[PDB]
Amino acid sequence: AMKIAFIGEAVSGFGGMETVISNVIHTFENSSPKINCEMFFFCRNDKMDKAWLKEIKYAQSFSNIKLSFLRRAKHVYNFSQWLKETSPDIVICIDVISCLYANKARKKSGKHFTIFSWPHFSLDHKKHAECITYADYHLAISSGIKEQIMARGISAQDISVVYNPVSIKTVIVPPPERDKPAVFLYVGRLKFEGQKRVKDLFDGLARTTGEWQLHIIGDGSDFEKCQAYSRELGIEQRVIWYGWQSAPWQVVQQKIKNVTALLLTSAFEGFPMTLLEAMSYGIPCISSDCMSGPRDMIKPGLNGELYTPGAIDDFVGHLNRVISGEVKYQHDIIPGTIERFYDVLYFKNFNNAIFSKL
Numbered sequence: 001a002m003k004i005a006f007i008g009e010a011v012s013g014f015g016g017m018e019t020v021i022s023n024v025i026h027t028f029e030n031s032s033p034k035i036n037c038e039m040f041f042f043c044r045n046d047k048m049d050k051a052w053l054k055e056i057k058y059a060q061s062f063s064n065i066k067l068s069f070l071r072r073a074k075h076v077y078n079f080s081q082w083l084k085e086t087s088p089d090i091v092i093c094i095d096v097i098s099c100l101y102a103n104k105a106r107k108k109s110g111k112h113f114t115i116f117s118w119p120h121f122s123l124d125h126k127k128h129a130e131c132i133t134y135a136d137y138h139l140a141i142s143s144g145i146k147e148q149i150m151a152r153g154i155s156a157q158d159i160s161v162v163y164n165p166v167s168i169k170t171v172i173v174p175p176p177e178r179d180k181p182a183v184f185l186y187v188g189r190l191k192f193e194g195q196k197r198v199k200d201l202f203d204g205l206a207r208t209t210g211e212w213q214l215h216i217i218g219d220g221s222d223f224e225k226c227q228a229y230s231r232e233l234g235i236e237q238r239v240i241w242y243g244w245q246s247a248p249w250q251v252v253q254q255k256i257k258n259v260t261a262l263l264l265t266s267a268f269e270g271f272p273m274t275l276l277e278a279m280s281y282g283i284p285c286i287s288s289d290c291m292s293g294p295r296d297m298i299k300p301g302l303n304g305e306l307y308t309p310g311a312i313d314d315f316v317g318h319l320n321r322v323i324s325g326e327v328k329y330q331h332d333i334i335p336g337t338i339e340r341f342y343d344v345l346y347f348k349n350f351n352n353a354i355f356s357k358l
């Protein structure tokens with residue numbers, strides 16, 4: 001009988017991370033005839049939506065002490081007490097600060113367990129990166145995160161790259177018929193610059209040679225700026241806006257039907273699930289080679305392309321070649337190119353990364 005604690009600061013209760021965590025917990029609580037999972041949250045308030053925890057046993061440390069030294073002390077004490085009630089074999093920290101908490105509460109509680117980091121954002125784009133050193137071993141969702149962890153003096157031997165899961169699909173979205181315009185897809189929150197750089201998307205497409213259309217599924221405060229920019233660039237007649245969609249891939253299947261490539265032009269990403277989703281439907285992806293995720297998914301010339309951050313010329317080149325057919329991606333084999341990301345194999349590799357360190 002083995003018990004796994006998943007711990008972190010309170011989250012919103014909606015987000016890719018929550019979805020991954022709940023699925024990994026439900027999967028564990030079946031695995032070996034249910035080996036048990038619980039959660040512990042460090043909270044300043046009870047504003048976390050609880051829906052995603054419906055079937056998940058969780059406890060909380062509440063402290064809104066304004067001085068962080070005292071709040072952390074209180075957190076560590078509360079977690080220490082929980083550890084004594086619960087006696088987990090393994091503690092997995094979904095953020096970096098919780099590695100510190102887990103480490104200090106292990107010393108305080110006198111309990112024996114292994115601490116794993118499992119961060120869901122680039123260490124260099126979030127607050128408490130140096131707290132990663134308090135975990136025993138590391139579960140990297142990307143090569144970039146592994147690199148970031150190594151940079152803090154952690155041995156590559158103590159870090160397993162586990163990626164993130166996606167569901168196997170039984171439908172392929174085919175390319176457009178020959179002599180139809182290229183069809184580009186953008187799926188995500190709209191930011192003109194900042195993280196998403198829709199500006200870069202528009203600048204590239206405006207410079208491309210050949211017939212193309214762009215389908216944009218998403219919304220954000222920069223909608224009007226982005227529409228204005230498309231008008232400025234003289235491309236508005238080739239852009240179709242869907243706004244926010246609850247079922248983007250249903251819209252793709254039912255309304256768009258044929259896709260040349262999904263495009264992502266981001267300055268950075270926590271984990272670009274959109275790329276994975278696209279490749280699960282056999283859609284090739286042209287992405288900025290940003291921290292982090294795209295380089296672990298995209299195999300240049302096989303399921304899409306990578307361009308160096310800011311290399312808009314390179315992006316344009318990638319576009320031109322897929323529009324002309326100079327480079328062709330085979331939609332029928334693209335789903336097989338992300339084998340290690342599919343739910344069952346992902347979980348197998350994740351499970352082995354944990355139990356191999358014991």
Ligand SMILES: O=c1ccn([C@@H]2O[C@H](COP(=O)(O)OP(=O)(O)O)[C@@H](O)[C@H]2O)c(=O)[nH]1
Nearest residue numbers: 187188189217218243244245246248273274
């Ligand atoms: O109109 C949309 C646009 C995006 N997404 C989903 O949002 C996720 C990532 O989008 P985003 O760029 O917002 O990343 P985040 O900021 O949420 O990390 C993906 O799983 C998409 O399928 C969606 O459901 N509807």
